[PDB]
Specification:
The structure is cut from a larger assembly and holds 7 protein chains of 7 kinds. Chain C is mainly alpha-helical and 61 residues long. Chain C is 64% helix and 0% strand. Chain C contains 4 helices and no strands. In chain D, 8% of the residues lie in helices and 23% in strands. In chain D, the strands form 3 sheets. A 6-stranded antiparallel sheet of chain D has the order 5-10-6-7-8-9, with no helix packed on it. A 4-stranded antiparallel sheet of chain D has the order 3-2-1-4, with no helix packed on it. In chain D, strand 8 and strand 9 form a beta hairpin. The longest helix of chain D is centred in the C-terminal third of the chain and has 8 residues. Helices cover 29% and strands 19% of the residues of chain E. Chain E is built from 5 helices and 5 strands, in the order E-E-E-H-E-E-H-H-H-H. In chain E, strand 1 and strand 2 form a beta hairpin. Chains A and D meet through helix 1, strand 3 and helix 2 of A and strand 1 of D. The complex binds magnesium ion (MG) (14 copies) and zinc ion (ZN) (2 copies). One magnesium ion binds next to helix 3 of chain C. Chain D binds 5 RNA strands through helix 1, helix 2, strand 1, helix 3 and strand 11. It is classed as ribosome. The entry lists the keywords Ribosome, protein synthesis, antimalarial.
RNA sequence: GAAAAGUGUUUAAAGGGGUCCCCGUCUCAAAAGGGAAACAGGUUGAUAUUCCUGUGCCAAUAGUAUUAUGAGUU
RNA sequence: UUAUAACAAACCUUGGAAUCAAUUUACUUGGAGAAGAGGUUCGUUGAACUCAAUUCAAAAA
RNA sequence: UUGAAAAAAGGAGGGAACGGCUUUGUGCUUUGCUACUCUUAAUACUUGUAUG
RNA sequence: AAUAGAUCCGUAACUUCGGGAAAAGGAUUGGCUCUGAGGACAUUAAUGUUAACUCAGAACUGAAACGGACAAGGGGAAUCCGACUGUUUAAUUAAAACAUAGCAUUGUGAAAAGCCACAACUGGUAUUAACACAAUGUGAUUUCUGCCCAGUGCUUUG
RNA sequence: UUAUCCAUUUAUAGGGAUGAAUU
């Protein structure tokens, strides 16, 4: 049975902390804890180790990324620009 | 402490001039078991002969300049 | 103490009144689960080894 | 009265930085013959957390052109860099994320980090997680280049000044609320002892301009002149406007 | 076609001959109760002739250019075949023989092989690329 | 139970002062200080434990025989076999590519 | 369009013909001379890719750099795992060889 | 800086390693961090992993010459 | 280096896996090679195991 | 919040250097001969009395 | 003082949907004698050797008693303050005070900058660089933050 | 620009066109 309806990952915090804040945390938590697709092996195994470090369990390659998501949109845009150049 | 199984090796060790002392022990086994100990400068080598006569023979063989200790 | 133990073995002392810890403390649910799963899994392994069960069946089970 | 919290800070006693666990300083390559006339290639051997920072570092190894041996430097990691990636630095380097180039050699719009404000400074601007500077022009007489810092400020720097193509890793760290006090406790515990923060208004007079009163209030304008002294610079220093920012 | 021809040069990838270059002599490709793997049978250089300078005297040069060889049967999955082939410069059948691998005087055979290699190095021919490659110690 | 006590000056439960309770021929339960378990010597590249080399502390590693410290490959007891292989491949393949490039140029 | 065509060809091969996927097998095939053409995923690890290329060169075989990722190369075949590189050893009705 | 003191590479000709080059502030700071190697029994009125008996372990060990111990070479 | 045995791993050879499989308490892993079959090593452990020896009888070099 | 450092030790790359004795000329070069390079342990002898 | 341990039941307003909640409120509990449920092996589906302790149920029994001592929440309906965990006047004040996350403001693009220290030279923040550092105010969330620049400040052009 | 001041490193090539790399 699915335990929480709207809470999800923020069930560890419980009643405390503003609900709005918890909602925001939830998105960020999801971003953090999702196994990202490694742009080397292909296996969705890249996970967050530190703040901006993303290590794959497959290759052991540490990829520098954003704090919560592996790629921030701005960075992607920058990359694209470079490619175009 | 070291255990020995090659009779020949034991003999060789005995023949060696750093071997000042020997020990021969008798033990009532659960017949008469016999331990042959050689005390070298660096190690104490011991051989367990289950067979009394053989043990006796080996003892006899042992150089009579060894300082043999009969423990029991 | 031995007599007490014997009684317990025959189920004598055990009873709702003679219980102070929760059910989990008395005998840990997790441990029980572990036991059960291990028993089942071992059995499954045995069966597949015997060829008595086919790999696919084993896996599903 | 007494010495205010701020004043105490400068002598650096219990107020020095917590420097013990840090991996070392992050610095660009020395500006050698290589970097000035061509490029030199290195490899990021590892990307690593630095405690007081919000952005991971990259340990990048180079070969000394003058002596037989490998030498390890500490770069700030741009987003998208990875272990075993090759880094190229120099006037004649190519324009890819990770590489290090003089601002003069990047077309406008390019996005860079770890920028030297003068040449040789080993990198000074745009270092924090998330930030970047953008090239917004090169003078027709050459020599200078115009950049826009994360603040908004436009500045003109030498074109020979080096920079690193791309954005700094760990972006958006500030998006997530520091829900608990303790998590902030942990954050500053690795920087310097500037946490707990008592309100001057909660202090007594000896302790703070704001200190004392039966009601807990500031009592006087809290905008203090630039030309104030040590114990007067306590509220909104040199504030050109105040209130909810509408602009 | 069949990449591993008798005479082609190959780099060993595994074992005590880790990154050494060698010439395959007889490919078997037949799995048995004995060797359940396709194996190559290879004669290679373990210790390459050290760099030489013109100023140096002849005897010393010769000493420098002494090559210590080796003969080993090895799984094909452990060798990297090269485009370089020394079919001509070496009478391959004469280098390594199947029966001699089993034979006691294996060390003697190895020595002979080494000597042959040295001789080859001494007399270049016109000059093959493969032979040059063989000569040049692999740096990794 | 027979109660025990530290004997090696250090009476604090530290990682170096870890203890194993041991019975003696005298009947008394005595304390023996366990020598710390050393970390396995790992690869230069991927930092994964290398086989063939005994995991011993800097003190114990000096007395140990050379066979327990070394593997007989090229890079031996510093790089795992796979990594060595990879390196070898790089050395060859890259070199080959270089040649090709040169040819193309000319 | 080219990518689509390639995919179609792959499908055809799968339907009718003999292939084998994955590094070691491919290498073996190359060694044999059984390989008619090898196809290498964008994301295949550099050294191994290089090795494959070398092997192909040795056998006067085509190399085909498949435009898409490891995952795609696998989705391209009837397989739910990532492939990396595969070796056609017999083409069916398909044209990919030419 | 009147000094006393305050700073510690901010414009130094700042001992070691190899066969002239290559390194390089010094020193103190842990009887819970790191670290060469010890255990058992017995013994005193009072000491014991420290004495005794027994068994070990660790670090040293100059040069020349003999010896044995086995390697490698021919 | 106690000799070995046992086991959690890591690796190697073989093998070629969708009717997805192996698998843990938990998930983890697998065409960048899984299961299975045979191995190697480190680490626990420190006489486990027939471990060693002995008693002789048969088969090779 | 990513959770010390160094002493010390080990491994690897790398390939400098290269047997002994006798004679001759100014450590170096030439000529002739074959047990040599290691390595533990023991021993004997000088040098300050060479185990804590 | 009452309440209390455990098992089984039963559980509201309200809510940030996580809680509230052990809500409230019930029932059961001993001893004895049984019964059923849960394994490991190893022989050849039957037959064996055998291991904990935990459940669940039924008799009988007693001066109706049983978490028999020990141990062990009183609960509810509300209102005010603080959101919360935390900290504090050592020896009269533990709080509604402080902190706190959150929100907002201000200064500073750098070794001729910001804020601070030092007699001086020099230093700290700073192994720092605007998602930073420094300085304030307010104090989770939810819902909003009106009007007034004459007065005092601060600040901008010369 | 030579005073001065700041930075940089071992004060290391005068200006332009995920191997190895040393005697
Ligand atoms: Mg549970
Ligand atoms: Mg605040
Ligand atoms: Mg405050
Ligand atoms: Mg007050
Ligand atoms: Mg005041
Ligand atoms: Mg008050
Ligand atoms: Mg107030
Ligand atoms: Mg000291
Ligand atoms: Mg200590
Ligand atoms: Mg409170
Ligand atoms: Mg008080
Ligand atoms: Mg408050
Ligand atoms: Mg409020
Ligand atoms: Mg207002
Ligand atoms: Zn990966
Ligand atoms: Zn590795």
């Amino acid at each position: 049975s699915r335990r929480t309806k709207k809470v999800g990952l923020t069930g560890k915090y419980g009643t405390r902390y503003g609900s709005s804040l918890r909602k925001q945390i939830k998105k960020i938590e999801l971003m953090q804890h999702a196994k990202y697709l490694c742009t080397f092996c292909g296996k969705t195994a890249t996970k967050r180790t530190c703040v901006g470090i993303w290590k794959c369990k497959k290759c052991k390659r540490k990829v520098c990324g954003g704090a919560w998501s592996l790629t921030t949109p701005a960075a992607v845009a920058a990359k694209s620009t470079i490619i175009r150049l | 402490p070291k255990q020995i199984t090659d009779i020949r090796k034991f003999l060789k060790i005995s023949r060696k001039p750093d071997t000042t002392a020997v020990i021969i022990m008798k033990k009532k086994s659960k017949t008469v078991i016999t331990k042959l100990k050689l005390r070298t400068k660096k190690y104490l080598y011991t051989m367990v002969f289950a067979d009394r006569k053989k043990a006796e023979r080996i003892e006899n063989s042992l150089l009579p300049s060894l300082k043999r200790i009969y423990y029991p | 103490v031995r007599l007490y133990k014997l009684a317990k073995r025959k189920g004598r002392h055990m009873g709702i009144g003679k219980r102070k810890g929760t059910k989990n403390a008395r005998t840990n649910q997790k441990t029980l689960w572990i036991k059960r799963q291990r028993v089942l899994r071992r059995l499954l392994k045995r069966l597949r080894d015997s060829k008595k069960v086919d790999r696919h069946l084993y896996h599903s089970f | 009265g007494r010495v205010i919290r701020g004043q105490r800070k400068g002598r650096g006693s219990i107020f020095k930085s917590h420097n013990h666990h840090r991996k070392g300083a992050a610095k660009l390559r020395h500006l050698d013959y290589c970097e000035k006339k061509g490029y030199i290639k290195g490899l990021v051997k590892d990307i690593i957390h630095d405690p007081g920072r919000g952005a991971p570092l990259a340990k990048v190894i180079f070969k000394r052109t003058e002596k037989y041996g490998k030498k390890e430097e500490l770069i700030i990691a741009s987003e998208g860099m990875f272990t075993g990636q090759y880094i190229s630095c120099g006037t004649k380097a190519p324009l890819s994320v990770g590489n290090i180039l003089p601002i003069g050699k990047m077309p406008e719009g390019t996005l860079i980090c770890n920028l030297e404000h003068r040449t040789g400074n080993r990198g000074t601007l745009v270092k924090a997680s998330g930030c970047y500077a953008t090239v917004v022009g090169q003078s027709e007489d050459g020599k200078k280049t115009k950049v826009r810092l994360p603040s908004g400020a436009k500045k003109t720097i030498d074109a020979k000044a080096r920079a690193m193509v791309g954005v700094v890793g760990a972006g958006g760290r500030i998006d997530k609320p520091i829900l608990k006090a303790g998590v902030a406790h942990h954050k500053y515990r690795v920087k310097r002892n500037c946490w707990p923060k008592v309100r001057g208004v909660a202090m007594n007079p000896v302790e703070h301009p704001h200190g004392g009163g039966n009601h807990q209030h500031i009592g006087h304008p809290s905008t203090v002149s630039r030309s104030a002294p040590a114990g007067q610079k306590v509220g909104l220093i040199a504030a050109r406007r105040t209130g909810l920012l509408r602009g | 076609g069949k990449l591993l021809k008798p005479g082609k040069v190959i780099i060993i990838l595994n074992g005590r001959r880790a990154g050494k270059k060698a010439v395959i002599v007889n490919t078997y490709e037949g799995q048995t109760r004995e060797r359940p793997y396709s194996y190559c049978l290879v004669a290679g250089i373990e210790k390459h002739p050290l760099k030489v300078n013109k100023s140096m005297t002849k005897k010393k040069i010769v000493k420098r250019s002494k090559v210590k060889a080796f003969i080993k049967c090895i799984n094909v999955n452990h060798i990297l075949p090269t485009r370089y082939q020394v079919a001509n410069d070496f009478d391959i059948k004469s280098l390594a023989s199947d029966d001699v691998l089993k034979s006691k005087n294996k060390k003697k055979e190895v020595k002979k092989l080494g000597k042959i290699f040295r001789d080859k190095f001494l007399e270049p021919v016109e000059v093959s690329k493969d032979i040059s490659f063989l000569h040049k110690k692999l740096y990794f | 139970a027979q109660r025990v006590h530290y004997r090696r000056h250090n009476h604090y439960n530290t990682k170096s002062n870890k203890v194993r309770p041991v019975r003696t021929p005298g009947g008394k339960l005595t304390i023996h200080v366990v020598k710390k378990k050393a970390g396995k010597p790992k690869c230069a590249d991927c930092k994964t434990a290398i086989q063939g080399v005994k995991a011993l502390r800097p003190a114990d590693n000096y007395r140990a025989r050379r066979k327990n410290r070394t593997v007989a490959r090229a890079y031996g007891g510093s790089i795992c076999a796979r990594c060595i292989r990879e390196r070898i491949m790089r050395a060859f393949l890259f070199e080959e590519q270089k040649c090709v490039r040169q040819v193309l140029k000319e | 369009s080219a990518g689509d065509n390639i995919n179609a060809k792959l499908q055809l091969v799968m339907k009718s013909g003999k292939y084998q996927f994955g590094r070691k097998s491919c290498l073996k095939a190359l060694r044999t001379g059984k390989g008619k053409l090898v196809i290498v995923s964008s994301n295949c690890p550099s050294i191994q890719r290089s090795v494959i290329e070398y092997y192909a060169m040795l056998s006067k075989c085509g190399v085909h750099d498949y435009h898409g990722d490891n995952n795609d190369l696998g989705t391209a075949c009837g397989k739910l795992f990532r492939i990396s590189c595969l070796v056609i050893t017999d083409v069916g009705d398909s044209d990919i060889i030419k």
